[PDB]
Design a protein around this ligand. Sequence first.
Ligand SMILES: *C/C=C(C)/C=C/C=C(C)/C=C/C1=C(C)CCCC1(C)C
Ligand SMILES: *C/C=C(C)/C=C/C=C(C)/C=C/C1=C(C)CCCC1(C)C
Ligand SMILES: *C/C=C(C)/C=C/C=C(C)/C=C/C1=C(C)CCCC1(C)C
Lengths: 222, 222, 222
Amino acid sequence: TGRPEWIWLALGTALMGLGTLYFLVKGMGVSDPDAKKFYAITTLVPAIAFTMYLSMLLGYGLTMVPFGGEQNPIYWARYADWLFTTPLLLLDLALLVDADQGTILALVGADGIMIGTGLVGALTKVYSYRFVWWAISTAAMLYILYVLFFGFSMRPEVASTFKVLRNVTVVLWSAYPVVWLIGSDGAGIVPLNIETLLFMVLDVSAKVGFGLILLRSRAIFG
Amino acid sequence: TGRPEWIWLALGTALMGLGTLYFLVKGMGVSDPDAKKFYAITTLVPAIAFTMYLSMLLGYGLTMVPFGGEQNPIYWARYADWLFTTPLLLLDLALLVDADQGTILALVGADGIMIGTGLVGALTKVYSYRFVWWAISTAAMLYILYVLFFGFSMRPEVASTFKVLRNVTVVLWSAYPVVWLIGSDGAGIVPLNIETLLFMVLDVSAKVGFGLILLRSRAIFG
Amino acid sequence: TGRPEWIWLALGTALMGLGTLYFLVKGMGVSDPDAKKFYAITTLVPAIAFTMYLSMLLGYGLTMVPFGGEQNPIYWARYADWLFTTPLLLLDLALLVDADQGTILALVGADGIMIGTGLVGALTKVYSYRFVWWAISTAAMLYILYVLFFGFSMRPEVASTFKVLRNVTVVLWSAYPVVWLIGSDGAGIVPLNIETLLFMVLDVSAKVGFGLILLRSRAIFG
Ligand SMILES: *C/C=C(C)/C=C/C=C(C)/C=C/C1=C(C)CCCC1(C)C
Ligand SMILES: *C/C=C(C)/C=C/C=C(C)/C=C/C1=C(C)CCCC1(C)C
Ligand SMILES: *C/C=C(C)/C=C/C=C(C)/C=C/C1=C(C)CCCC1(C)C
């Protein structure tokens, strides 16, 4: 396309679409209920991502936001995706450790705040206000990572898998507020082409990457 | 109104509104918890449909989408409805057969993809791209119907009711991708007047029709 | 700001932000699972409200709706908030009395209808149609309050707390359809400045006020 970032949105689409097929196919073979749960969640995540990367690729989820001087291109389909897939990932972590209903509530709620404010700054028109919405969104991410460390004696083919996935999450999720800040969505110090490349490498890793590690573990069984 | 399809949107509103009253009234008389569940779900479905048919009737959920040459009228309130009521129907089927949490997750997730992509093609501006979003949406419908047949020894006043409702669903739900394709939302081979007539006959049948069959069955009790 | 209602949206933001901090901090100290549940829900409610009051304050959730003659200012961020926080409050009441899944479904569903139609009239362009959407929205509020009285033998440090919270709810929630009618969103008999003052006093009371009463009760424990 006439857009420099098409290549990464094209590669994003393929990879997400590839992970869903692999996981669905892999998904075929399960009988253990609990294990079913982890396939249902893990497969839907890139399934959703698949639909939003295509929408950006065909250009449906792209808008112009006016701010800091001129008109700015902003992929909003990114947040609609994150809106559903991140709560879906925390749910994988949550049911892995037999979380409490109460803690599952807080995580999900804080998550919706995270993305929700992230979307608000993405579409905000006053340049300065954006980073205030960024701060709050970041403040919720700190809560979530906090909770999965200090508020989150279980069987060991579980614990060890959880510590692994959680390390992945914390490192990946932490990159997103950094990319957004340096990117076109935030400081504008990095062009849209690179900002799109960064998110795609995170998304595939945090989704397909995360799912592969997960759906192989014996942790997901009885 | 100045719109040819008012009559069907007017009849849609009455019928949906009539089913909700009947089901709520009928709903009054229940004590068995589990049965309560099926009244809660079954009544809310046309309740929601009721609100969206009126919005189309008063014209709040109507927009113009430019594509394939000219400006196209598109009722988007239809998808906001389907967004909530179809997961509500699968939930009726799901709890009827004591589905697994895992399978309830997949159905609902695939459903949101179905409608979600359906909405995206409805609002897409490049004529050709629409049917690509149609294909994917259809691909999710095939998953759902699949699952309720091959991934979905239970008491017989249940099994027989389930096979019935499920037959209804498969036949009705299959009509929707056909109507959308021939209709104004898709191929434009059928005018908006007829496309509105078709969806109304499906909606009332899949909702009120489906609910009547359901809320009479002894299957919904202990 | 250049807006007369800034002061109340500024005071709304502070107070909601203050309640969340207090509840989170207070939240630190819990071990009993069930009690955790009530902190998770109760704290997220003003957390969300916090984000939407700021959005109105910075002016992100403000739009112009044309009707009854001229252009009308309409804070839509108010409904996105109510969209999530009112179901969150009913859930506090619901789990307080060990509600049935079925009844929890009806309450939440009716609630989404309430706000959902409320939003539709807020954005409707034909003056008269607004109050029709107001009527239906009100009709759902009557269902909810009904249900929490006649469809909602439990331990007494519970029952007495429930009767209390419920009295709060009914009196507060009943004020909202009145404010909306006399306000700029409805009849226009009260200016936006006063209508914004009224909602802020209700919101803080129904949220922070409601939460304080709740998170002190021994009802929330085992
Ligand atoms: C499947 C995609 C994933 C796991 C995405 C994670 C995204 C985030 C952790 C988002 C973080 C953001 C902030 C905390 C600040 C505002 C900007 C965001 C939304 C990128
Ligand atoms: C209460 C209304 C019901 C049960 C509606 C069902 C609608 C569908 C099965 C929708 C199907 C569609 C596709 C599979 C392709 C894209 C167009 C849609 C959304 C009409
Ligand atoms: C946290 C905020 C609360 C508890 C708000 C409650 C709001 C309502 C009970 C809303 C009621 C309305 C109607 C019943 C008629 C239409 C206008 C509304 C949305 C204000």
